[PDB]
Amino acid sequence: LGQTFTFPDLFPERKGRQKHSPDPRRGGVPGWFGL
Amino acid sequence: ISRKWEKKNKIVYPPQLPGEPRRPAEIYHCRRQIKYSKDKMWYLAKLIRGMSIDQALAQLEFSDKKGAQIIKEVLLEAQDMAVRDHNVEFRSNLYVAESTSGRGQYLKRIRYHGRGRFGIMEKVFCHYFVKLVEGPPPPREAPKTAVAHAREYIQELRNRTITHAL
Ligand SMILES: [Mg+2]
Description:
The structure is cut from a larger assembly and holds chains A and B.
Chain A: no helix or strand
Chain B: E1 26-34, H1 38-47, H2 53-62, H3 68-84, E2 94-103, E3 107-112, E4 118-123, E5 126-134, H4 146-157
Antiparallel strand pairs in B: 1-5, 2-5, 3-4
Helix pairs in contact in B: 2-3
The complex binds magnesium ion.
PDB class: ribosome
Keywords: ribosome, translation, large ribosomal subunit, mitoribosome, mammalian mitochondrial ribosome, cryo-EM
Entry title: Structure of the large subunit of the mammalian mitoribosome, part 1 of 2
């Protein structure tokens, strides 16, 4: 009948930072220990 | 397979008694299953022995062998662990203590010849081992002088006995 189809996009995309890095100046000292 | 060398970093020592000699840092590192052959790798390993890490890096860098880029990365890794994971003041203070190649496991393939004959072709792999020690490089041994030889010889003439004689 002159109809045009197009395939529906079925996935619209609609849905519902820890830095513990060792201290450069500590020189490998296990920082948890305070003294 | 056997993994040993890697575990040589897991030794923890008893603390230091007062005023003894400070035991210098030992760092071990290996690289397993390199695509290089064992015998070619041996020459590189032989070249850098006893050198300070900077000289070794210098030599390796300009060398042509495809093993050179490999041993280079391994020495850089070793150095980084030397300052980070162990404690080493002054990162150029390292020298190469022991450098060596072992053979890895090998692949086996067919090699066709002619008249329908085949040889058995072995794809080669090898491991590279290096032990670095913190301190200035040990002094290279000087060739024996005439004053040395004459001393050996006399010491030998003077070590004689009258044999079967008592
Ligand atoms: Mg063979």
